[PDB]
Amino acid sequence: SVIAKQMTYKVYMSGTVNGHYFEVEGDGKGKPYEGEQTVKLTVTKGGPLPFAWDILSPQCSIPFTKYPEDIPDYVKQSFPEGYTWERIMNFEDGAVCTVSNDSSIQGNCFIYHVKFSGLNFPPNGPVMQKKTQGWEPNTERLFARDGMLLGNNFMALKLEGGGHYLCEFKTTYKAKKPVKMPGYHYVDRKLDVTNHNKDYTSVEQCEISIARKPVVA
Amino acid sequence: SVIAKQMTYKVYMSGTVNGHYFEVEGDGKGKPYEGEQTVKLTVTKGGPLPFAWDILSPQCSIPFTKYPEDIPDYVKQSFPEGYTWERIMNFEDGAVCTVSNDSSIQGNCFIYHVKFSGLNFPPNGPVMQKKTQGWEPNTERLFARDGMLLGNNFMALKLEGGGHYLCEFKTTYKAKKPVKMPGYHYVDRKLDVTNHNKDYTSVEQCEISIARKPVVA
Ligand SMILES: [Br-]
Ligand SMILES: [Cl-]
Ligand SMILES: [Cl-]
């Protein structure tokens, strides 16, 4: 296969949050068939970021999803041609982000180019005041439509002091060639910041992603 | 406990869909601690319904949810005082439903009073043209806030011909007394129409609901 049991990846992300421009570069690695992966990011421009790092962590790698053999793996099949993805994040306090990615492969390394646009975060909310403490483990609902893989996820950020800050994700994955489409299924993830420097200009993330059928069916 | 291992329930539902008034009555039974239940519904007024039965099936019983001992069971704890619930269903073609319930107990029988308001279903859409073929097995994201249990679910109806028709649920459960609040968790459900007459004026449904912690955590 063009996707080896061990792979690396590079992340090039740029964008704005409430008008604040930034750039990030990442170097990641993982086991695509085990759904295990890690990434080390550096804020290369606009740092230190005046907003919660957590809104950016889910934008830094779908080939690293363990798919059981009886569920077609849309993203792994798209290679070597690759795929793109388009995400809408609707936060419960009215903030909205639109994120686009282009994913390609160069030997044993995936290349992700990401554009992030976030705005309408309340200036005294938990994202601009950096009161978030990571995403809860989550489940993306996935199904096939018009040759694209459509995902939806009721996400939630944990807050300093308790409580949750809700965010709805809508992600559409678009393979650059036709592939075998999967049935209606889910992907469970855990995403954690495992290390960071004082001002989050260097961050390390670990993510485990596993596809499955419904538990009760 | 006030909730026995085998219980019955009665449903009294009324409402409108694109201005069409109806009433439904149901007789149900199940094993609350096993998350198993079945209900028989009869359209008592405004039948045959000119819209898909499927939009009404999730309005006909949260006490019948299997909760592990280490996850507080918000709804079972609310009894004998009981609880209410409020639901918003946003369909992808712009249709919206608001549903309210009052749930009480009389001995070994729960009593559900439901009010349904649905509108903006396109006249040539799958609900008004009766092209739906049941709900996909699904997962409700649940968490506690201000003494209420908040649920969200990315639901989908199967369509005649193979597609899906998406619906977002937001359900708020409100106990009539304070109860021990659970942590962030999920409920998996399968909901099926197991029998019906030609015009869906008599319908039988089976539902299995099981609470759990995230699969990947
Ligand atoms: Br670091
Ligand atoms: Cl398709
Ligand atoms: Cl609470």
Author numbering:
A (entry chain C), B (entry chain A): 2 to 61, 65 to 221
Pull verbatim passages from the article behind this deposition.
The structure of amilCP has eight molecules in the asymmetric unit, with four of them in the same tetrameric arrangement and the other four forming a second tetramer within crystallographic symmetry. GfasPurple and amilCP have the same chromophore composition (Gln62-Tyr63-Gly64), while the chromophore is composed of Met62-Tyr63-Gly64 in eforRed and Lys66-Tyr67-Gly68 in spisPink. Previous work has confirmed that S175T and S61C mutations alone are sufficient to shift the colour of gfasPurple to be the same as that of amilCP. The glutamyl moieties in amilCP and gfasPurple are sandwiched between two glutamine residues (Gln38 and Gln209), and this is also the case for the methionyl moiety in eforRed (Gln38 and Gln211). Similar water channels are present in gfasPurple and amilCP, stretching between the chromophore-interacting Met159 residues. In these two proteins, the water molecules also hydrogen-bond to four tyrosine residues (Tyr188 and Tyr190), as well as the protein backbone, aiding the stability of the remaining imperfectly packed hydrophobic residues within the interface. The same hydrophobic residue from each chain is at the very centre; the Phe158 residues in gfasPurple and amilCP form π–π interactions with each other, while the two Ala190 and Ile162 residues in eforRed and spisPink, respectively, form hydrophobic interactions.
Anthozoan chromoproteins are highly pigmented, diversely coloured and readily produced in recombinant expression systems. Here, high-resolution X-ray crystal structures of four open-source chromoproteins, gfasPurple, amilCP, spisPink and eforRed, are presented. Like GFP, chromoprotein monomers have a β-barrel structure that contains a chromophore, which is autocatalytically constructed from adjacent X–tyrosine–glycine residues encoded within the protein sequence itself.
